[PDB]
Every structure is written in C-alpha cells, then in structure tokens.
Design a protein around this ligand. Structure first.
Ligand SMILES: *[C@@H]1O[C@H](CO)[C@@H](O[C@@H]2O[C@H](CO)[C@@H](O)[C@H](O)[C@H]2NC(C)=O)[C@H](O)[C@H]1NC(C)=O
Ligand SMILES: *[C@@H]1O[C@H](CO)[C@@H](O[C@@H]2O[C@H](CO)[C@@H](O)[C@H](O)[C@H]2NC(C)=O)[C@H](O)[C@H]1NC(C)=O
Ligand SMILES: *[C@@H]1O[C@H](CO)[C@@H](O[C@@H]2O[C@H](CO)[C@@H](O)[C@H](O)[C@H]2NC(C)=O)[C@H](O)[C@H]1NC(C)=O
Ligand SMILES: *[C@@H]1O[C@H](CO)[C@@H](O)[C@H](O)[C@H]1NC(C)=O
Ligand SMILES: *[C@@H]1O[C@H](CO)[C@@H](O)[C@H](O)[C@H]1NC(C)=O
Ligand SMILES: *[C@@H]1O[C@H](CO)[C@@H](O)[C@H](O)[C@H]1NC(C)=O
Ligand SMILES: *[C@@H]1O[C@H](CO)[C@@H](O)[C@H](O)[C@H]1NC(C)=O
Ligand SMILES: OC[C@H]1O[C@H](O)[C@@H](O)[C@@H](O)[C@@H]1O
Ligand SMILES: [Ca+2]
Ligand SMILES: [Ca+2]
Ligand SMILES: [Ca+2]
Ligand SMILES: [Ca+2]
Ligand SMILES: [Cu+2]
Ligand SMILES: [Cu+2]
Lengths: 695, 699
C-alpha cells in the first residue's frame, strides 16, 4: 500500500526518532508556548511519482516510505518553522530538512498555525484580564459574571508578519451551535509576541463603534453614552436547538446488499469488479484518491482536495475582514466521525483514520471514512422499443462512494468521491453545518439577512480547489477544446434557400496559459485531456472535465492578500505536473497570505502542455447570502459543487454494455422468467449501532 | 375536494369519443387508418381548468369547474381542409361541444401543420418500398443485401418554408432486438407528401453515400453503368453497436431499497401525499409531464410545474442530419411515454401507475406503469454538525427524497423526466436523456459534424434543450421578482486608514418589467434570482422561492433562421411573464411541421408588462451540447447529463422546516448513542417479500 496514510505504529516510531535527534527541551505541542520547540504535524510524505509508477507498473522496489514533520522552533535567537522528512519506515534511520529546498529560505515563524494552547492563552487573557474591565456593560447586555466563548477569524492582521486576530464573543450555548449568538462584542487581539505576557488588545468593537480598549468602552457606558439591550441567553426553536420536537416516525428507506457487499476495503485500497483505487486524508489538504484503475487500466494518478476558502462581508470588523484558508486549520486534522445511518448509509463500511497532530502520541478519528455501494434509483441507461422491433434494454445505475467530512468550527464540509459504472468519476463537495453570524445592529441590508432575533447571516462565498492528475492512457497528455458554431450557408439541394449549419470546432491547447480559464469568462463546452493514442475508431483517447460550479466573484486581484489563494481566480487550469509543484496551497498561507508560502498562479508560466504529463486544477464554489432556512444548519440541497471526469472516446464502446447487472428482453420472451431476466429472480442483518465519540 | 387535474380516465375518454362520433356528420374515419382526405379525431385529452375557478374551488370552497376535454380533429374532406380544436362538455356525461380554434389562433389551423399520422408514415413506406426502391433493385441488391430488410426514419421539419411537407427519410438496416439507428445504409430520400392524394406523392431528391441524384432511376442508371463507387456496409455483427444484451452473466445482486416500517407516502388517483408534500401529477399528450397544486405542509408553493417542449438541433454532412430540428411536442412526450421496467427505470419497490390516452384511435388505450412514485434514500445527509468544540453533540438528518418519474421514448432517445421533492421545502426538476443516438452514414469530412462511433457510423453533433413552465404562487398569487448578487467595494479599513480592504456587499434589485427578467442564453444571470411575496417572514424579509438553473446550454439556433421562432424559448435561460389563460403553453403540437409560421411564438409573452405584484409565471430552459462519442454506444448514459432546476426557499420560512423532521437524529456526548430512546437508529437492528416481476408490454 504505497499511498496508505501513516499507521499508529509508523506515527509513533517517527515521534520516537524525532525525540532522540532533537535533544530535549522539546515540548508537547498540546501545551507548548510560542517560545518552545514542538512537533506540530507528522504525516505521510507522498512518494515521488516516477519511483512509484516504477514500482506499480514495472516490479521495481517500493520508494522509501517517509514522513513529513512540521516543527515549531521557537526556542532560539531566530525562531522558525521547519519541514523535516523522516527516515526509511517502519524503522526511521535518517532525518532531512527540506525547508530551504522547497521555499528558498526559512519559514517565518508567524506563518505557523495558531496552536490549540495558543487559543487557550488568548482566552485566559480575554476572560481573566480584559473582559472584567467591562463587567458593567457586559452585565447589562450579556448576563456577564463564564458564559461566553470566542471564535477566531481569517488572516490575522493587515500586513505580512502580523499576528492579530479578531475574535467574536458568543453565548456559550450547550448542546447546540454557539455560532448563532454573537453578543455584539469583537476584540482585535495582538498575539504576535513570543511571550504571551506582552499580548495586547489593539481594538474593540461594539455596536457599530470602535474603541482602543475595554476600559475605554466600559467608560463610555458608565458615562451613559452607550445604549445597552439585554440579549436573551436562552430560547426555543432552530436558533437554540438541533433536536427535533417531533416524535420519531416510521423509518426512512434502507438499502442492503441482497447477496452480500460487492466491493472490499483492505487498508486504504478499495476494489470492485470495476474499480480499484486508494484513499486517504492529508492532515491539511484533506481527501485524496490515488491510482484509480478502471478494469485494470489507470485513469488518474491522483485526485485530491487542495484547499477550501471562505470569503466574508459584514458591518462588523471580524466578519468584514474574514477570509478563511481552511488548509491552515486542516481538512484532515478536523475530520469528524461519521454517524452511521445519517452521514452515510447504515450498511456502509466505516474506516478509521490515525494522526499525530499537536500531540506526541498518535490518535484516531473513529469512522472517519465510509465506503459503500448506492443504488441511485435511476437508470444508467435504457431504451424501450415499440418501433419495428419489440425489446427493452437497460441498467439501473449503482454507484461506488468514498466519503469523509470536515468540521471546521462551524461548517461541516462533506467530501464525496463517486465512481460510476460508465467509467466516470464524480467529485462532490457539500457544505452543511452552522453559518457564521454577526450581531444584528445598524444598516445590515448590504451584508446579509436577519436570520434570527439579533442574528445577521453574513454574506460570503465558499470555494474549493481540486488537483486532478489524469494520466489518460499514459503520462503524455494533450488538452483539447471542442465546442460548436453555426455557419450560414446555402441549402445544397435548393440553393436559393439558407440554413444555419451546425458544426463542431476543435482546438489544441498547447501552452499552459491557453488552458487557464478564469472565473467570469466562458470556457469551451467540451474540454478534455487526451493521449496521442486513439480508440478503435480513430479518435484521441480522452477524459473530459465537466464542472459543476456556481462560482461567486473571486476576491479582487488588487487585494494585497489575494495571492494566498490565487487559484480562486480560475475555473479550471492545466499545467505540467512537477514534483516541486505538489499542492496549490499550504498550511502556511492562512496566517500570512500577503507573503504566500505557495502561490498557485506561479504554476502557470508559459510552458508547453502538448505531450507532457499534465495535471488539471479545478475550482468549485458558490455565493451564499443566508436566509432563514439556514437556521439550525444549511442544507445540502442545491449546494453540491465539483466536477465529472467523463470518458470521451477513451473506450471503444460504453463499458457498461458488458455489465453483469444489465437487463434485456424481447417482446416474444417471458420477461417474468428468471432465466430471461434476473429481476424476476427469487431480512438484512444489521450491526449494532455505535458512535465514534468526541474529543 | 376534487381531483381537479387528473388526466381523463378510459371511460371519460370513451365518453367524449362517443359524443364526437355522433355530432361529426358521418364519414368520420378511425384515425388509425385515416388518409389525408378523411375526417378523423387525432387526439382526445383533458382540458385543464381555468386557474381562477380552480383556486376558488381548492381554497374558497367554491364548486369545482366543469371537467372538460379537448379534441383535435383533422377535417380533411372539404374544399378548405383544416385542423380544429374542440372542447367537449361536462364530464362524466358530456352534453356540449365547442369550437375554440379561432379564439385561440385568430383563424383556422392550416392543414399542413397537423402532425403526420401513423397511417401517413405507412403510406410513405408504401411509396418507398413498393414504387420507388425497386427502381434501384440493382444498386440495393449489391450494397445492402436487398431482395424490406430496411426501415425508414423521419426527420425535423418537413420543407424549407411555411406550407411545405417534404420529409428527408434515412434508410437503415432493420436490425432486431437492438437499435437500427446505428446502421444507416447511406441512402436518404426527400419524400414530398404535401398532396392529399398519396398517389401524387413524389421524391424531390436522392442522396446516396455522399452524392446527390434526381431519382432512384438516375442512380440506378449510374450504378450499372459502373459510375458509382459503392461502399459495402455489413448488415450485422457483434458488439455494443449490434446488441444491447450483455454477454456477461449476472453477478451478485445490486443493492435493494425497502421501507422497514411500511410506506411513508400514498398515491390515490393522480394525487400523492407524504407528511410534507401533497401534489398532483399527469401527462399532457404532447407537452408531457406536469405537476399541479404542490403543497408543502399544507401551503401551496407552485400552482403548476410542467414540461413545455423538447428540442434537438443537429448538424452533419448528410441532408437528413444537416437540416434536422426536432420539436418533440409535435410528436408528443405523453403520447410516446413508455412502460417503466420495474427494478431498472425505478426502484423495485416503487409505486407504479398506468396512463390512459385516446390518440390516433377511437378506443382508449393504456400505457401500463407509465409513472413511478417512490421515496429514495439519497445516501447523503440533508444537514449535519459534529461538535467537538466547547459542547459535545451531534445533530443530523439523512436526506430521503420523494420522486415522480415518467419516460418518453421518442424514436431513438429515451427522456427521463424527474420531479423530486426535498424534505427542506425545495423542488428539483430533472431531465436525463438516454437511449440510442441518431446517426448518419460515415462519409466525408466528418470532423466538423461529429465523431466516428462504429464502423460506418457517424454520431452527429446536436444540441438538447427542454422548456419548463414554473407557475410559482409564492405565498399567494401576487409576486415580484428579485435579483440579488454580490459586489466588492474597495475602501479603507475603518480602523486602519492607510490600509485597503475589498468590502464584500450584497446587491438587491427589483426587476419590474417582463424584459428585465428575461435572460438570454449567454448573458450573465443574477446568482440569486427569486419570486417573492411582499409579505415578510418572521425576520422581515420578502418570502421568496429562488430558481437555481442546472444547465450547460449550447448555442441557440441563430435568429436569422426563418424557422427559429418555432422554438424561441431556446434563446432564453429564464424569463418571467404575467400568467395568462391565453398563454397556457410556450409551444404547440403544431409548431413541428411549420416552424416558419409558428402556432405559438414564446417570445410574444415578453411584451413590456409589469411583473410587480402580479400572478407571475417563470419559464426555464435547460439543455446542453452533445458531440457523440464511443461511450454513447449502445445507448448514451445518464451520468452528468441531468439538467433542470431547483426551486429553493429563500426567506419563505422562519427557519428550516427540516428542524421539525421525524427522521432527524441528535445526541449529546454525555448520552448513550447506542440507546434506543436517544437514537432511533439504534433501534434499527424485517425486509418485505417482493412482488413477482411483471412488465408493461409493447405496441
Ligand atoms: C461551554 O458550554 C459547555 C456546556 O456544558 C460547558 O461544558 C462544561 O464545562 C464545565 C467546566 O468544568 C465542566 O465541568 C462541565 O462538565 C462541562 N459540561 C459538559 C456536559 O460538557 C463548557 O465548559 C462551557 N465552556 C466554557 C469555557 O465556557
Ligand atoms: C374548420 O372545419 C370545420 C369542419 O368543416 C368547420 O366547422 C364547420 O363549420 C360549418 C360552418 O361553420 C358548420 O356548418 C359546421 O357545423 C361546422 N362543423 C363543426 C364540427 O364545427 C369549421 O368551420 C372550419 N373552421 C374554419 C375557421 O375554417
Ligand atoms: C423488422 O425487424 C423485426 C425483427 O425483430 C421484425 O419483427 C418481427 O416481425 C415478425 C413477423 O414477420 C413478427 O412475428 C415478430 O413478432 C416481429 N418481432 C418483433 C420483436 O417485433 C419485423 O418483421 C421486421 N419488419 C420490418 C419493417 O422490416
Ligand atoms: C504519439 O502519438 C502517436 C501517433 O501520433 C501514437 O501512435 C504513439 O503511441 C504516441 N507515442 C508516444 C506517446 O511516445
Ligand atoms: C514563452 O516562451 C517562448 C520560448 O519557447 C518564447 O519564445 C516566448 O517569447 C515566451 N512568451 C512569453 C510571453 O514570455
Ligand atoms: C402589497 O402590495 C400591494 C399594493 O401594491 C398592497 O396594497 C398591499 O398592501 C401590499 N402588502 C404588503 C406590503 O404587505
Ligand atoms: C412600455 O410601456 C411603458 C409605459 O409603462 C412606456 O413608457 C414605454 O414607452 C413602453 N415601451 C415600449 C418599448 O413600448
Ligand atoms: O348541422 C348542419 C349545420 O352545420 C353548419 C351550419 O352552417 C348549418 O347551416 C348547417 O345546416
Ligand atoms: Ca497526469
Ligand atoms: Ca509550469
Ligand atoms: Ca404565479
Ligand atoms: Ca407579457
Ligand atoms: Cu455559506
Ligand atoms: Cu444527445
């Protein structure tokens, strides 16, 4: 299993090694202060592609199996973040610092994600030292005494090098989302200092007005210059609960496998009579799929989530300057247990996921993946003939699915990899869970809708970026753009007459820039990566990229931070796959987008894409103005974005023709005979329910 | 109350047919074998009630409107032949008949606009195979195993200007147990069948494997004179292009869906009801699928959602393919509806429903299992949230959905029409195209007109597009249309003036005139576009439903085409007009055979009228470009081809209705999630006996 994420054992063994090589003074990241040395991340380092294909397709031995550790080196004159590759696994022997090799220099220490212990320190400051200075105001507005909690925001500051975060204050609602109860107080905390003692509060926001400290605010209030409204800290309805007041009814439909599962899961490889592939989670990039072979032939080397991005508006400071680059938190790191029956079909197969993050010992997110077959209740294809000959032929589409979900504070991102029996691959991304809210005060008409009492549903956009490493019939691929045109010309057999003549238009895209399409501008209706090899009928074997996106307007290029997610400007882009261009974002962009650790636009640089090993990059998104129907959560309906990889002259005929599940009968046959029709042929056992728990 | 939108039953149909039989002075012929000269009843079907009367009944308890039928009659025997639309009296037992043709059209219906009768196709095949084709027995005998082992297939319009009735017929190999559409032999006849006397029918042009001739005689001449390079096309073989039956034996069973504790919806007539939804469904003979009186938890959302038309515009180098614009309503999406194979077309345990029609006949007939209704478990959460933060809990709900499906098989393609009702209050309309592709003989510079797909088989390039009528009555009849969207406003950071920030804002515009809310294909449309009441929800926003389009529309036929006003709805992604009784449909069964003189021209509905505070109706066009490829053989698959739209609630409610779901799951960390009384799912761990498989048969 070349692409399997690191096991608990491998994780442990690399942490063992790291502790030896870094002579103590090394602290457990779970309790580390800024000036300490700690291990932040330890996870699988993906192998180089050539070495891997060598192994998979030519017997050649397995590329060394290595880990990548992210270390916070704060205990030194010039602190920094280092990426260290760790030696041959199962039993590590070397350690290699690749930081400069990759970035050209050190990683500025301020790009390091805010540690859990850091958030904790920030809270101690706010709750123990800063808030009690306004115990007057906070008593008359927010039942102060703790009853409140904080939620961090986007990039932290305004220039490269800043580490100042706007926090909102929310009623600490129990058993339900606190995100819907902003109490109207927002704090700009400056925690750039290595000594948490020197941490200050640069700004304060309350009801439309800014102050320089809480004392200054508490002042204006004791001076009777601030009007306070007692925000209720309790209620009933969707705003306050997630539990339905309605008794359970008869159960929803259930799918089972009459003659047992028709696929198997072995570690991280999945196999069905049609598909074999590997799956996993990057701690920061999230879901990924490797070595996808349809009936033994490889279509894609890699499909992987690169980044998720949320961009906000609002009439409060926190909201209006919020741009989450979710990889900076980690789609994998924040993956949550799948609730059997709700998040996946009850009889799905559920797999665990192991990680060493902000810790010194491995941990496991139980039931992190689900794999299952799903009857779509829909024909993959069908024809019914009443004309000339009486026959029916069709096939009910069943689909193979791998899924994980990431809960980043509020939102719960659902990541779907769907394998169709037609030879097609579908990548879906559903955004559910809670919205972010602001306190409703002022002229909120331009920044969202009132979505509850005191609650503003702030306008925003969601986008995600995907890496699509297709290797259509080998590595050397070309990209084609086919479309249509009408050409007015005389009717051959009656030349006085005209006719708008429909024509196909093909165009080879030979330079990276030609296959870079921007959000906003139109893209060709047919776009695919081809080999020079042809199918039986002499057409380039190709796989077509079809996008499902309602992408909202991307953050303006003029923004000094826009280059921390330059991929958001592109619908689709295609480039030469390079070992040095592994991902299009980085865990280090979130905290310093002004000095991006990777800038996707760098990948598009006047190179040829004619006959190379290419890699496609797809962006999918939508705009979101919140409405009442988002209370409790936002629903998945309509907000599914992503793309299809559809075969296009790749095969000689539709592979599903050879399906073991296809149905066919003529008029002169007994369609109710089981030897004519398998449908005419012929008490699920259900495991005890169990939940992954919490942390 | 009354089941007001139900399609006519067999006896209702019989009753109307009998009533007409009498009052149409004898000579009336059974249309199933009528000639152009005869008088015959072409179709008899339900006439939808006027909206005012219908709502008065449904809402204010008024008496229900008279139940009427509409009959289309072909009046062939007379000096000035014509098509007439007749409404037939009060129904269980009719007593009146009225002619509404001039009321609806301002004059008579020119007789050439009438669809081609099945008997007419028969006579054409007579003139072809009995009087013309033998004039070339030589060529035919050499190239195509000739010796009626061949079949014809009709095409788009029938001519080049208003009044023409000349069809191009491709000739194919009569394959068996599989589509003949893939085996074009290269011969294409331009049959002129305008004349009322089929003896006077001529062949205006001939096309054979790349070349034009003036008759099959001239082509026969040139053949035996050794002057035609004939390409031999095999008349059978093996593979997907010759079969549809899988050579592979059945494996382990596919997944099966069942309802553990009984069904959770009920069909009674044409009306469906679950705990969240009630609606009525049916098929227009020509317009196809339709939904009426949709109510979510008791409240009406849409008065009507109905298919209006289906289009197919082709290219190619053969004259048939090259000039083909199907306006499928001209054949009829209901008329060509087909039985649903249980287990394939719908879940096995779905509820199936028959459909009754009187079409080109004199006795009612039934399509068995024409509709299916079922709950489907999407295998996807509708909503969910796992909280590890501050408070430990999980709250979620697996989306189960309510579906009504019918398919129309129009010659080669099978269109699957979906109507999907989500537990969130949303309505999803889907349209999948599957079945066989229309093909041409492969010869020439095929590059600009499609891909080679089998030996000798060119998959011709074409566009698809369906038109949908969405009469939303959002919180009452009076609606307005809103366009909301985003914008970035560069400004200075309010707390750090020498710094810049791109301020994200919402933009709300009221579209007040029909034109402001008409969006052509190719121009940009508001990300948020919705119809709303002027009544507010609990939080004082306009109660609205938004229209989210799922379309990859191709280039609409250029306006400079004299025939483009036969489907001018193709040029619009979306439009919103005042709803009018006299604007019932955006197409017509009569547009197909005279798109140059359209019976209805959808563009007329957009005429500088207010759409502020009126009974509004939205029109939605979904479609896409299709360049056929190898994976379209034998049929084109449904994956990725689903077009249509969502109707999504936007401040219509005060919170998400699914909060009150009976199926929602929730448990705190400090609870046993494996205990029944906290988690219904735990109480899960019998399956039903299955009904014996039965199928609906053929014609
Ligand atoms: C936020 O709300 C949760 C809800 O209970 C609080 O949870 C408790 O915190 C106290 C503090 O020690 C624990 O003793 C309780 O047992 C926790 N209860 C359970 C059932 O979760 C939470 O602590 C509040 N957090 C703060 C920091 O405000
Ligand atoms: C269309 O054809 C019908 C049938 O001939 C015409 O209807 C007849 O019209 C004459 C005079 O109006 C009447 O005597 C018959 O009673 C009518 N028969 C029926 C069933 O209505 C009809 O008038 C023609 N309409 C026009 C506009 O041409
Ligand atoms: C076209 O092909 C079909 C072959 O399947 C022929 O249909 C059969 O015709 C015979 C009579 O000759 C019937 O008894 C069979 O029932 C038919 N089979 C089916 C399933 O319908 C058909 O005769 C041929 N007709 C044409 C126009 O060529
Ligand atoms: C390149 O294309 C040729 C035909 O142009 C094809 O036959 C061959 O397989 C390809 N050769 C490569 C990719 O080295
Ligand atoms: C791109 O590279 C080519 C060299 O192959 C060069 O001729 C051309 O000028 C370059 N274009 C730009 C825009 O730099
Ligand atoms: C809706 O608008 C009409 C008139 O344009 C008005 O008379 C009615 O009172 C309005 N309802 C409101 C604003 O709630
Ligand atoms: C449309 O009607 C308005 C009156 O409300 C009038 O001002 C305008 O001139 C008309 N426009 C056209 C194109 O007829
Ligand atoms: O029923 C016959 C009737 O139909 C027509 C009318 O114009 C009458 O003149 C005629 O006599
Ligand atoms: Ca590749
Ligand atoms: Ca490059
Ligand atoms: Ca309306
Ligand atoms: Ca109008
Ligand atoms: Cu959102
Ligand atoms: Cu098609």
């Amino acid at each position: 299993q070349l692409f399997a994420d690191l096991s608990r054992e491998e994780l442990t063994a690399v942490m063992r090694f790291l502790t030896q090589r870094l002579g103590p003074g090394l602290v457990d990241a779970a309790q580390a202060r800024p000036s300490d040395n700690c291990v932040f991340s330890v996870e699988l380092q993906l192998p180089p592609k050539a070495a891997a294909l060598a192994h998979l397709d030519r017997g050649s031995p397995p590329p060394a199996r290595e880990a990548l550790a992210i270390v916070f080196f704060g205990r030194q004159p010039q602190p920094n973040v280092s990426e260290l590759v760790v030696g041959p696994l199962p039993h590590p022997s070397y350690m290699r610092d690749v930081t400069v090799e990759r970035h050209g220099g050190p990683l500025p220490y301020h790009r390091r994600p805010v540690l859990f212990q850091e958030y904790l320190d920030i809270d101690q400051m706010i709750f123990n030292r800063e808030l009690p200075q306004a115990s007057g105001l906070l008593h008359h507005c927010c039942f102060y005494k703790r009853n409140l909690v904080t939620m961090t925001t986007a990039p932290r500051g305004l220039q490269s090098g800043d580490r100042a975060t706007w926090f909102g204050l929310y009623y600490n609602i129990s058993g339900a989302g606190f995100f819907l109860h902003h109490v109207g107080l927002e704090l700009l905390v400056n925690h750039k200092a290595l000594d948490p003692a020197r941490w200050t509060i640069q700004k304060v926001f309350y009801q439309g007005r800014y102050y320089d400290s809480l004392a200054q605010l508490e002042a204006q209030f004791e001076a009777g210059l601030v009007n306070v409204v007692l925000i209720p800290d309790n209620g009933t309805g969707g705003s306050w609960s997630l539990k339905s007041p309605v008794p359970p009814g008869p159960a929803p439909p259930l799918q089972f496998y009459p003659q047992g599962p028709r696929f198997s899961v072995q570690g991280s490889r999945v196999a069905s009579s049609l598909w074999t592939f590997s799956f996993g989670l990057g701690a920061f990039s999230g879901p990924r799929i490797f070595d996808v072979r349809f009936q033994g032939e490889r279509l894609v080397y890699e499909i992987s989530l690169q980044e998720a991005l949320a961009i906000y508006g609002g009439n409060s400071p926190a909201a209006m300057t919020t741009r989450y680059v979710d990889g900076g938190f980690g789609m994998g790191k924040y993956t949550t247990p799948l609730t059997r029956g709700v998040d996946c079909p009850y009889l799905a197969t559920y797999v665990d996921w192991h990680f060493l993050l902000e810790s010194q010992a491995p941990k496991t997110i139980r039931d992190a993946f689900c794999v299952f077959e799903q009857n779509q209740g829909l024909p993959l294809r069908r024809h019914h003939s009443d004309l000339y000959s009486h026959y029916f032929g069709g096939l009910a589409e069943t689909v193979l699915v791998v899924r994980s979900m990431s809960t980043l504070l509020n939102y719960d991102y659902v990541w779907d990899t769907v394998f169709h029996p037609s030879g097609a691959i579908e990548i879906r991304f559903y955004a559910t869970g809670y919205i972010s809210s602001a306190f409703l005060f002022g002229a909120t008409g331009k920044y969202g809708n009132q979505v509850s009492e005191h609650t503003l549903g702030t306008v925003h956009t969601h986008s995600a970026h995907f890496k699509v490493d297709l290797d259509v019939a080998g590595l050397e691929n070309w990209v084609w753009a086919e479309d249509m045109v009408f050409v007015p010309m005389a009717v051959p057999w009656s030349p006085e007459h005209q006719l708008q003549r429909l024509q196909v238009t093909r165009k080879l895209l030979e330079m990276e820039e030609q296959a870079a399409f921007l959000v906003g501008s139109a893209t060709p209706r047919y776009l695919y990566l081809a080999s020079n090899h042809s199918n039986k009928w002499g057409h380039p074997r190709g796989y077509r990229i079809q996008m499902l996106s309602f992408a909202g307007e991307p953050l303006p290029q003029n923004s000094s931070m826009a280059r921390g997610f330059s991929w958001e400007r592109y619908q689709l882009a295609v480039t030469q796959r390079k070992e040095e261009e592994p991902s299009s974002s980085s865990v280090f962009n979130q905290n310093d987008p002004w000095a991006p650790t990777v800038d996707f636009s760098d990948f598009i640089n006047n190179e040829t894409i004619a006959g190379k090993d290419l890699v496609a990059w797809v962006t999918a998104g939508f705009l979101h103005i919140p409405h009442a129907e988002d209370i409790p959560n936002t629903v998945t309906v309509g907000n599914g974005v992503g793309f299809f990889l559809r075969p296009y002259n790749f095969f000689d005929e539709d592979p599903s023709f050879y399906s073991a599940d296809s149905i066919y009968f003529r008029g002169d046959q007994d369609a109710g005979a089981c030897e004519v029709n398998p449908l005419a042929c012929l008490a699920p056992d259900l495991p005890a329910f169990s939940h992954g728990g919490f942390s």
